[PDB]
Amino acid sequence: CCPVNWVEHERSCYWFSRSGKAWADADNYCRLEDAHLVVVTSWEEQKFVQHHIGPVNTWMGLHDQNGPWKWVDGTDYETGFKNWRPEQPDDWYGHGLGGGEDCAHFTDDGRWNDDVCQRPYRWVCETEL
Ligand SMILES: [Ca+2]
Ligand SMILES: [Ca+2]
Ligand SMILES: [Ca+2]
């Protein structure tokens, strides 16, 4: 069973924030719930998450902080589902905040973008039943 206020979908429980945090803080929040930032592995799961977040920048459990792109729960990135907006990920430095872009988020249309990990975005936690 999923906890109260969590949403069950295909053997996973999801929690959709209605507040924003920097990626590291969202990551910590999910771990303290015995969960992890959402790991998207199919078009079905992608459509499900999109439905609940709406047209809002939302962090997921995908990052390339100090190494290649990796899912927070160990799921393989190279052989897995991807939904990047064409021309992403670009590791952009042009925001002028220092560094590239190391954290993935759903954009307003659901396609993914890599962005500055310090930005405060909403987030999604996931746990597997
Ligand atoms: Ca998942
Ligand atoms: Ca990067
Ligand atoms: Ca980008």
Author numbering: 152 to 280
Q: What does the original paper state about this entry?
A:
Herein, bifunctional probes have been developed that target the hepatocyte‐specific asialoglycoprotein receptor (ASGPR), the expression of which decreases during NASH progression. To analyze how the probes, bind to the potential NASH biomarker, X‐ray crystallography and saturation transfer difference nuclear magnetic resonance (STD NMR) spectroscopic methods were used.
The 1.4 Å electron density maps showed unambiguous density not only for the GalNAc moiety, but also for the first 4–7 atoms of the linker. The density for the linker confirmed that the binding site was occupied by our chemical probe, rather than by the free monomeric GalNAc (control experiment) in the mother liquor. In the crystal structure, the 3‐OH and 4‐OH groups of the GalNAc moiety are bound to the calcium ion in ASGPR where the 3‐OH group is in close proximity to the calcium ligands Glu252 and Asn264, while the 4‐OH is very close to the calcium ligands Gln239 and Asp241. In addition, Arg236 makes bidentate hydrogen bonds with the oxygen of the acetyl group and interacts with the oxygen at the 1‐position of GalNAc, where the linker is attached. The nitrogen of the N‐acetyl group interacts with the side chain of Asn264. Finally, the 5‐hydroxymethyl group of GalNAc is stacked onto the indole ring system of Trp243. The linker itself does not appear to interact with ASGPR and is mostly disordered. In comparison, the scaling factors of monomeric GalNAc are significantly lower indicating the lower affinity of the single sugar moiety compared to the triantennary GalNAc groups of the probes GN‐01, GN‐03, and GN‐05. Additionally, the CH2 groups of the aliphatic linker region of these probes show strong, positive STD signals due to binding to ASGPR.
